[PDB]
Design a protein around this ligand. Structure first.
Ligand code: SF4
Ligand code: SF4
Ligand code: FES
Ligand code: CL
Ligand code: CL
Ligand code: CL
Ligand code: MG
Ligand code: MG
Ligand code: MG
Ligand code: MG
Lengths: 624, 625
């Protein structure tokens, strides 16, 4: 089918799209077509629904009418407020994620989280000492954890002048933030202040609104997400390199297939542990299965991949198709990016759709709520539901379409530094020598507006060919993985300089650095490289790119990348083009404020040219 | 003009609308007409922009298309998420306001706020003791203040199971909230969680979303707003009854007129103090003025009215018209409900438009930022800017249209209890005897969709005629004031029972209880009455109404009133009618969950009937006639 061919580059997606059509199942692509064309005001950002003096629409008319909202706000204010709330929603997703990790580490410290423990005590003592816990090296681990919990919770309070992890950024960058009024102070506080500023008659200056949008996003990258990443490593282990597989072929016809979907490893790690219990495995055998097969979707899949090597079934636009295989015995979801259509598609089969979070409620789902105190018992209950669902699987509707593709995951900063011998000097030397011209983090989503993973894969191939190492996170992981680029042998696809470094280290030219919260690792790596060189992050040969983004979370990541000094490419524009001034600020003006700006370019080859050009200019700023 | 008559019931508004039209000045009414008809999907709530898989619209088409967003979300989810973010924006406005008061009290306790003091130490010690500060009755005031600051900041953290002031609610109500998952835990936390829940692929159950909307609003009424009110009383004094005046006639042709606008008294109290410095008064006289004349707009005006008796120039839809008088020499703004049109209208005159908050930035304004450590110095600079602007006032463009109307303000709960002799017993006795059949808080805004204050005033008149005492806050204050209902003599307009009680106490039938954050005073009063009677707030003969609301803050107030058990009337619907299920939950389903629901009724006489009928039903359950 020509329609099916245009929706994805992958054979496993094509096969399930044909199967979905044959069974009359509507997918995200079908609903995207129904919503095209979109409302032009909504797409431009020139619409406001923030009070019931409105709603209002703005147009650039010669007769002067509809130039202002009822309150008098112009297009610049309305667009900037909409963008600010958009970013705030993204930051809030990461904020609540990080908060849940704090609450879990606290439950461990109190001895009230059966089945949870401190799995990297060394990192616990290191992070606690870094953030100022007294005698972190020698005090009992639970006491050190309790003090770290208090520091993290205080960053979710209203009394700080700067977030705890912000001290990682170079001094020149913290000084710049302080002067600009951009320093993030509290993870929840910046979000709440954004919602206040965007109320009618509060912040009515587009520049001020965008500066606080930067501050809100920085409170994510250096706050909610960084706390999420570092505490997840403490609770579940610091990732180290390991082999795994990717695509729908990780599902097994002869096993109980449990797909974990969503974001928080507090749930998926305990689902995994439940499947490994002897009596639970025995119950699956008694049902006729060969074993229990856990496979990951989206970010929680990234987390199990990074720490346990659990194979990943797919990314955002693969989620509906994973159920269409007919082999998904249960989906276990927590929150964020879980399309509610999955509840209806699961209803077409035997599949149990299980929700686990009080925040991720889906009408018609099977709710088995999970908290640290009951997770071990509840996750065992959930696996038994999956085994019971497996006994009702219709074999005539099963179609697992592909063979899995080998990948290498686990590239935490700890893992990168260990592969380098313990210091960043061999990496710095390769950059100075020009073997590695720079680094680009390719992050973010899929979007039905772009043929699935076409731009993600093309940009990855273009960059490594130009001796630019790629750091992959989020749903881009599945793209690079299915393209064969997450293995050391993919050095054959890189330019001469990058291939030589990769082969000397035994690593791929594309390093999987984790989930979307683990974009905080890229911030940490840039801060480390800048501090070692005595420069700003805005002087490093780095870039960021989300060629196929969709979510508010992705926009917040892009904003905190830009605000931290990292030129950031987006394949698609945010809904801001109705304000020329807001657009010019995002694409150009921010360069003169924070030392980086957004780029919007749907051609991934042209995006590669633009990212490379910034890297070249940065290499000149360093006199290379 | 028939068009001008239809926009407001007030002569001062009519006069300035005529003047604005003659000078070619566009007002909020003119822009409301340009924006009518509105977008159908935006009006119904059936549109979503929460990701760039969209934007999406939900339609009812024969081919069945556009029933779902690209992610699969239906109309119920989209409408509920939109209403949830709407509520979170209102809660956030009050939240940041309360936070600023915490930071001000902390600066005072540290001795780093020249010109600020603890004006009500007795209330400081009482509130601190109520919230658990050890030895609040005896320790040094600055130590007690530091400990109270810590308790208030902890409610803006992420470690509480319940907000500190929630203990005021009766146990039965706290038990209900706890079972429902509605207990507010952290003022910022609930707002952040709402923004998370409304991200694509998180909370996709409309009942769940509305329950968290209730929790988010409760974190305002029992958190951000109540902290704001109580700390404002501690810093600037507990309101007591006093006389003042209202309407555009409070401006003086012979004076430097400084209009304070916005919400935070931390600024307007220090502007007022600066105008009272002898050297600053002398500068105004040397410029030709008789004096400096501070007048209030919107909530910061309510604040200065309640605590200093400062006359109030007008409410929401009067704000542009106050500049059209040609006598506004400076507008001093902080944040919230400040229409950016005021910047352009000021530019048509000599008026200086001064912003004072890092949060309230206006392109083209004169920014003179104010913080506790520099407010005394900066507010003096702002008043000197106003005196300079006065020297450039064009006398030929001045038209102050009316004579001011006398009002009585200052009815804090402390003042009400003092008028009752120290206890609520005489008020309960009047309620039991049926002299006062019930109480209704009339709160909230103006809205160009309704002839200004027509519904505010008609509802107030209808209720007091039916022996229902009215508690007025926000922009309703100005409406009742200009109607002549905020004075003791207005008992003549109430029914026989309410008139007798009012005359025995010497109070008006309409009690001004302050600004929009001071709607927390109404929550405190209901909680006190419920606890004294041993019932829930949902058992009290009470109601709430915003006949002419517009803001997200007003919806958050309505939501936390409903969630606390207060039947709440809105003159206009929120943008939710695109979902019958969400609408039915708001208007009916909540009744069975929290003991109260929303009502939507644009006819203020019918609104009076519905509010009274709820009051009659609650009086029956108390065993009264
Ligand atoms: S805030 Fe202003 S632009 Fe937005 S809906 Fe209200 S009146 Fe219209
Ligand atoms: S969240 Fe769902 S309904 Fe909203 S814009 Fe995105 S795809 Fe459309
Ligand atoms: S749907 Fe109302 S403006 Fe786009
Ligand atoms: Cl035109
Ligand atoms: Cl508590
Ligand atoms: Cl009722
Ligand atoms: Mg706990
Ligand atoms: Mg500033
Ligand atoms: Mg301070
Ligand atoms: Mg619950």
């Amino acid at each position: 089918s020509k329609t099916i061919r245009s929706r994805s580059i992958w054979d496993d997606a094509h096969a399930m799209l044909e199967k979905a059509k044959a069974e009359g199942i509507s997918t995200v692509w079908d609903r995207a077509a129904e919503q095209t064309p979109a409302c032009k005001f909504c797409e431009l950002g020139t619409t406001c629904r923030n009070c019931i003096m409105g709603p209002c629409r703005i147009a650039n008319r010669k007769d002067g009418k509809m130039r202002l909202g009822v309150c008098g706000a112009d297009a610049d204010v309305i667009v900037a407020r909409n963008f600010g709330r958009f970013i705030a929603g993204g930051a809030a997703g990461h904020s609540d994620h990080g908060r849940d990790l704090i609450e879990t580490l606290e439950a461990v410290a109190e001895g009230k989280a059966p089945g949870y423990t401190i799995r990297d005590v060394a990192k616990l003592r290191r992070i606690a000492a870094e953030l100022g816990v007294a005698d972190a090296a020698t005090r009992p681990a639970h006491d050190v954890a309790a003090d770290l919990v208090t520091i993290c919770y205080n960053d979710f309070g209203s009394r700080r002048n700067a977030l705890a992890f912000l001290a990682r950024a170079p001094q020149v960058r913290r000084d710049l933030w302080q002067r600009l009024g951009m320093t993030p102070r509290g993870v929840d506080r910046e979000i709440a202040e954004m919602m206040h500023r965007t109320h009618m008659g509060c912040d009515n200056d587009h520049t001020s609104l965008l500066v606080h949008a930067a501050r809100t996003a920085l409170a994510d990258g250096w706050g909610g997400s960084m706390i999420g990443t570092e505490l997840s490593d403490i609770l579940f282990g610091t990732p180290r390199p390991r082999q795994s597989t990717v695509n729908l072929g990780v599902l097994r016809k002869d096993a109980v297939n449990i797909l974990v979907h969503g974001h928080n490893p507090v749930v998926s790690e305990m689902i995994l542990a439940a499947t490994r219990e002897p009596a639970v495995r025995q119950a699956a055998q008694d049902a006729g299965a060969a074993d229990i097969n856990v496979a990951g979707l989206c970010c929680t899949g990234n987390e199990l991949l990074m720490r346990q090597g659990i194979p990943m079934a797919g990314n955002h636009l693969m989620t509906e198709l994973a159920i269409v295989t007919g082999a998904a015995d249960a989906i276990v979801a927590d929150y964020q990016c879980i399309m509610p259509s999955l509840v209806q598609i699961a209803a077409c089969y035997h599949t149990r759709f299980v929700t686990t979070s009080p925040k991720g409620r889906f009408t018609g789902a099977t709710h088995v709520e999970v908290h640290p105190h009951n997770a071990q018992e509840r996750c065992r209950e959930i696996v038994m539901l999956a085994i019971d669902a497996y006994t009702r699987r219709d074999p005539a509707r099963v179609d697992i379409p592909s063979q899995p593709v080998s990948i290498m995951s686990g590239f935490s900063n700890e893992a990168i530094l260990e592969a380098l011998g313990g210091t960043p000097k061999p990496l710095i030397d390769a950059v100075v020598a020009g073997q590695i011209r720079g680094f680009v983090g390719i992050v973010g989503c899929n979007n039905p507006k772009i043929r699935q993973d076409s731009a993600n894969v093309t940009l990855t191939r273009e960059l490594i060919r130009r001796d630019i190492m790629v750091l992959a996170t989020g749903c881009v992981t599945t793209a690079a993985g299915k393209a064969g680029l997450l293995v050391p042998e993919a050095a054959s696809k890189a330019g001469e300089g990058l291939a030589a470094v990769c082969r000397s280290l035994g690593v791929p030219p594309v390093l999987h650095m984790g989930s979307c919260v683990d974009n905080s690792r890229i911030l940490q790596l840039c801060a480390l490289l800048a501090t070692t060189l005595g420069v700003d992050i805005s002087d490093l040969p780095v870039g960021a790119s989300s060629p196929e983004w969709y979510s508010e979370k992705a926009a917040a990541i892009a904003m905190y990348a830009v605000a931290s000094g990292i030129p950031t490419h987006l394949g698609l524009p945010p809904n801001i083009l109705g304000s020329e001034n807001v657009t010019a600020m995002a694409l150009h003006g921010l360069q003169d404020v924070v030392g980086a700006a957004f780029m919007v370019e749907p051609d991934p080859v042209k995006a590669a040219d633009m990212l490379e050009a910034h890297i070249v200019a940065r290499r000149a700023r360093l006199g290379l």
